[PDB]
Protein backbone atom coordinates (compact mmCIF):
# COMPACT_ATOMS: atom_id res chain seq x y z
CA UNK A 1 0.00 0.00 0.00
CA UNK A 2 0.97 3.61 -0.12
CA UNK A 3 0.00 6.50 2.03
CA UNK A 4 -0.41 9.95 0.60
CA UNK A 5 1.68 12.79 1.85
CA UNK A 6 -1.39 14.25 3.49
CA UNK A 7 -2.01 11.00 5.41
CA UNK A 8 1.64 10.91 6.60
CA UNK A 9 1.21 14.48 7.80
CA UNK A 10 -1.79 13.59 9.95
CA UNK A 11 0.19 10.66 11.36
CA UNK A 12 3.32 12.69 12.08
CA UNK A 13 1.36 15.52 13.57
CA UNK A 14 -0.31 13.40 16.28
CA UNK A 15 3.00 11.56 16.78
CA UNK A 16 4.77 14.86 17.56
CA UNK A 17 2.30 15.14 20.49
CA UNK A 18 3.02 11.57 21.68
CA UNK A 19 6.73 12.46 21.69
CA UNK A 20 6.19 15.16 24.32
CA UNK A 21 5.73 12.26 26.79
CA UNK A 22 7.01 8.97 25.38
CA UNK A 23 7.23 7.11 28.66
CA UNK A 24 3.68 7.94 29.78
CA UNK A 25 2.20 6.95 26.38
CA UNK A 26 4.33 3.80 26.40
CA UNK A 27 2.88 2.84 29.80
CA UNK A 28 -0.73 3.61 28.82
CA UNK A 29 -0.49 1.61 25.63
CA UNK A 30 1.09 -1.53 27.15
CA UNK A 31 -1.33 -1.49 30.06
CA UNK A 32 -4.23 -1.07 27.60
CA UNK A 33 -2.91 -4.02 25.65
CA UNK A 34 -2.46 -6.27 28.71
CA UNK A 35 -5.85 -5.44 30.16
CA UNK A 36 -7.59 -5.99 26.87
CA UNK A 37 -5.66 -9.07 25.81
CA UNK A 38 -4.07 -10.58 28.91
CA UNK A 39 -2.58 -13.46 26.99
CA UNK A 40 -0.11 -11.00 25.51
CA UNK A 41 1.44 -10.40 28.95
CA UNK A 42 2.69 -13.97 28.89
CA UNK A 43 5.11 -13.06 26.15
CA UNK A 44 6.93 -10.74 28.46
CA UNK A 45 8.92 -13.08 30.62
CA UNK A 46 10.25 -10.03 32.35
CA UNK A 47 7.03 -9.15 34.04
CA UNK A 48 4.50 -11.78 33.37
CA UNK A 49 3.82 -11.86 37.10
CA UNK A 50 2.39 -8.31 37.45
CA UNK A 51 -1.17 -8.95 38.53
CA UNK A 52 -2.82 -5.61 38.66
CA UNK A 53 -2.93 -2.35 36.86
CA UNK A 54 -1.42 -0.60 39.84
CA UNK A 55 1.41 -3.05 39.78
CA UNK A 56 1.89 -2.35 36.05
CA UNK A 57 1.85 1.34 36.65
CA UNK A 58 4.59 0.98 39.10
CA UNK A 59 6.88 -1.24 37.18
CA UNK A 60 9.94 0.66 35.92
CA UNK A 61 10.75 -2.25 33.65
CA UNK A 62 7.36 -2.06 31.92
CA UNK A 63 7.90 1.63 31.39
CA UNK A 64 11.35 1.16 29.92
CA UNK A 65 10.04 -1.43 27.50
CA UNK A 66 7.19 0.85 26.53
CA UNK A 67 9.67 3.62 25.70
CA UNK A 68 11.70 1.13 23.61
CA UNK A 69 8.59 0.02 21.72
CA UNK A 70 7.41 3.48 20.94
CA UNK A 71 10.77 4.89 20.07
CA UNK A 72 11.27 2.12 17.50
CA UNK A 73 7.75 2.60 16.11
CA UNK A 74 8.23 6.33 15.82
CA UNK A 75 11.52 5.78 13.88
CA UNK A 76 9.56 3.62 11.47
CA UNK A 77 6.74 6.06 11.01
CA UNK A 78 9.13 8.89 10.34
CA UNK A 79 10.49 6.99 7.35
CA UNK A 80 7.05 7.36 5.72
CA UNK A 81 6.95 3.93 4.14
CA UNK A 82 10.65 3.72 3.32
CA UNK A 83 11.36 1.42 6.24
CA UNK A 84 12.91 -1.72 4.87
CA UNK A 85 16.11 -1.32 6.86
CA UNK A 86 14.47 -0.60 10.17
CA UNK A 87 12.12 -3.56 9.81
CA UNK A 88 14.63 -6.34 9.21
CA UNK A 89 16.27 -6.61 12.65
CA UNK A 90 12.84 -6.01 14.14
CA UNK A 91 11.11 -8.78 12.23
CA UNK A 92 14.00 -11.07 13.01
CA UNK A 93 13.86 -10.73 16.81
CA UNK A 94 10.11 -10.77 17.05
CA UNK A 95 9.81 -13.84 14.82
CA UNK A 96 12.74 -15.95 16.12
CA UNK A 97 13.47 -14.69 19.62
CA UNK A 98 10.21 -13.47 21.10
CA UNK A 99 7.76 -15.29 18.75
CA UNK A 100 5.11 -12.60 18.49
CA UNK A 101 2.23 -13.63 16.20
CA UNK A 102 0.94 -11.12 13.72
CA UNK A 103 -2.29 -11.08 15.65
CA UNK A 104 -0.54 -9.56 18.70
CA UNK A 105 0.72 -6.70 16.47
CA UNK A 106 -2.90 -6.18 15.52
CA UNK A 107 -3.81 -6.02 19.31
CA UNK A 108 -1.12 -3.44 20.10
CA UNK A 109 -2.22 -1.35 17.02
CA UNK A 110 -5.70 -1.24 18.56
CA UNK A 111 -4.23 -0.23 21.88
CA UNK A 112 -2.25 2.62 20.24
CA UNK A 113 -5.34 3.90 18.52
CA UNK A 114 -7.34 3.76 21.79
CA UNK A 115 -4.81 5.73 23.75
CA UNK A 116 -4.26 8.38 21.03
CA UNK A 117 -7.95 8.77 20.82
CA UNK A 118 -8.30 9.36 24.57
CA UNK A 119 -5.31 11.60 25.01
CA UNK A 120 -5.37 13.60 21.76
CA UNK A 121 -9.03 14.01 20.62
CA UNK A 122 -8.37 17.31 18.93
CA UNK A 123 -5.58 15.91 16.79
CA UNK A 124 -7.15 12.54 16.41
CA UNK A 125 -10.37 12.98 14.55
CA UNK A 126 -11.63 10.51 12.03
CA UNK A 127 -9.31 11.30 9.15
CA UNK A 128 -6.24 11.26 11.44
CA UNK A 129 -7.33 7.93 12.93
CA UNK A 130 -7.88 6.52 9.46
CA UNK A 131 -4.41 7.67 8.43
CA UNK A 132 -2.85 6.14 11.59
CA UNK A 133 -4.67 2.88 11.04
CA UNK A 134 -3.35 2.87 7.42
CA UNK A 135 0.20 3.49 8.62
CA UNK A 136 -0.05 0.68 11.14
CA UNK A 137 -1.64 -1.74 8.66
CA UNK A 138 1.26 -0.95 6.29
CA UNK A 139 3.71 -1.67 9.09
CA UNK A 140 2.02 -5.04 9.89
CA UNK A 141 1.82 -6.15 6.24
CA UNK A 142 5.52 -5.49 5.69
CA UNK A 143 6.50 -7.15 8.95
CA UNK A 144 4.29 -10.17 8.05
CA UNK A 145 6.02 -10.53 4.64
CA UNK A 146 9.38 -10.40 6.42
CA UNK A 147 8.26 -13.07 8.93
CA UNK A 148 7.46 -15.29 6.00
CA UNK A 149 10.93 -14.87 4.54
CA UNK A 150 12.47 -15.61 7.90
CA UNK A 151 10.51 -18.89 8.17
CA UNK A 152 8.01 -17.83 10.83
CA UNK A 153 4.96 -16.25 9.37
CA UNK A 154 2.88 -16.21 12.51
C1 LIG B 1 4.43 -1.50 17.58
C2 LIG B 1 4.99 -2.82 17.64
C3 LIG B 1 6.22 -3.21 18.23
C4 LIG B 1 7.42 -2.65 18.12
C5 LIG B 1 7.86 -1.54 17.18
C6 LIG B 1 8.25 -3.42 19.02
C7 LIG B 1 9.65 -3.21 19.18
C8 LIG B 1 10.46 -3.80 20.08
C9 LIG B 1 11.82 -3.40 20.30
C10 LIG B 1 12.63 -2.34 19.56
C11 LIG B 1 12.31 -4.17 21.26
C12 LIG B 1 13.81 -4.26 21.73
C13 LIG B 1 14.81 -4.99 20.86
C14 LIG B 1 14.29 -6.32 20.35
O1 LIG B 1 14.11 -7.24 21.15
O2 LIG B 1 13.92 -6.40 19.17
C15 LIG B 1 11.23 -5.07 21.62
C16 LIG B 1 11.42 -6.13 22.55
C17 LIG B 1 10.39 -6.86 22.91
N1 LIG B 1 9.15 -6.84 22.33
FE1 LIG B 1 8.46 -5.85 20.79
N2 LIG B 1 7.60 -4.40 19.59
C18 LIG B 1 6.38 -4.34 19.10
C19 LIG B 1 5.39 -5.22 19.45
C20 LIG B 1 5.56 -6.22 20.45
C21 LIG B 1 4.46 -6.99 20.98
C22 LIG B 1 3.03 -6.79 20.49
C23 LIG B 1 4.93 -7.91 21.88
C24 LIG B 1 4.18 -8.97 22.71
C25 LIG B 1 2.76 -9.24 22.68
C26 LIG B 1 6.30 -7.64 21.91
C27 LIG B 1 7.13 -8.36 22.65
C28 LIG B 1 8.41 -7.92 22.94
C29 LIG B 1 9.21 -8.54 23.91
C30 LIG B 1 8.85 -9.77 24.70
C31 LIG B 1 10.39 -7.91 23.94
C32 LIG B 1 11.41 -8.05 25.07
C33 LIG B 1 11.28 -6.90 26.07
C34 LIG B 1 12.35 -6.95 27.16
O3 LIG B 1 12.22 -7.82 28.00
O4 LIG B 1 13.49 -6.58 26.90
N3 LIG B 1 6.65 -6.58 21.06
N4 LIG B 1 10.09 -4.84 20.88
Swiss-Prot record:
One of its GO terms (biological process) is removal of superoxide radicals. It catalyses: Fe(III)-heme b-[protein] + nitric oxide + H2O = Fe(II)-heme b-[protein] + nitrite + 2 H(+); H2O2 + AH2 = A + 2 H2O. Changing residue 122 to A: In metmyoglobin. It is found in: Cytoplasm, Sarcoplasm. The keyword Transport applies. The keyword Electron transport does not apply. InterPro entries: Globin, Globin-like_sf, Myoglobin. Its EC number is 1.7.-.-, 1.11.1.-. The modification Phosphothreonine is found at residue 68. Transmembrane segments: none annotated. Monomeric heme protein which primary function is to store oxygen and facilitate its diffusion within muscle tissues. Reversibly binds oxygen through a pentacoordinated heme iron and enables its timely and efficient release as needed during periods of heightened demand. Depending on the oxidative conditions of tissues and cells, and in addition to its ability to bind oxygen, it also has a nitrite reductase activity whereby it regulates the production of bioactive nitric oxide. This is Myoglobin.
